[PDB]
Amino acid sequence: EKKKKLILFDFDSTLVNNETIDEIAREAGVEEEVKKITKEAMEGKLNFEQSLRKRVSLLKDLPIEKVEKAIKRITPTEGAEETIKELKNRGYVVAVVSGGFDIAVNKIKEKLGLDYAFANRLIVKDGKLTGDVEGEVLKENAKGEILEKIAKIEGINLEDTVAVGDGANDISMFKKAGLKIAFCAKPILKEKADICIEKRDLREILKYIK
Ligand SMILES: [Mg+2]
User: Fold this and answer.
1) Quick check: is 160 catalytic?
2) Contact at 8 Å (CB) between 181 and 197?
3) Does domain 1-15+77-209 have CATH number 3.30.420.250?
């Protein structure tokens, strides 16, 4: 026998190298403005939901074909698939929980073979973004609520959970997690982490997890 563990990964800047919202902002012509808000939000200087709605509103009217062009530029972080496969090899459950968007996160869930995926969604009308976003990964304690929910479904004690992220919206996930790993993270999350990894290779987390 042997117990399973549950590992939750943030998406933007953690499982992938990019910030989905910033990539889309480039196609919408508001890259500078959105990048600045994203940085403040991930450093913990802004309420997450308010900052995300402010950024998504700047994307109003962008055609879906341009959103896809931005998504195409997203690349997986070094070692991502190998790390996920090794965790699954141990019999562990793996999830991605993101303040980003299904249109990007759906793909990685299937590509890397994840068991769960939670993200927000961009609202679309007549083939263009309306500027609205909706979802359950918006409130300040959203990720922690999701970690608890998944752990309950799987019968896994919170002490056997691991959270891996880079930004301030990963703090609520860290609060409930058994092991807190800040991956090439912002100072506000590093302060709360058990382990800080600065080499950009997800395989580095494996050493800390039995
Ligand atoms: Mg992130």
Assistant:
1) no
2) yes
3) no
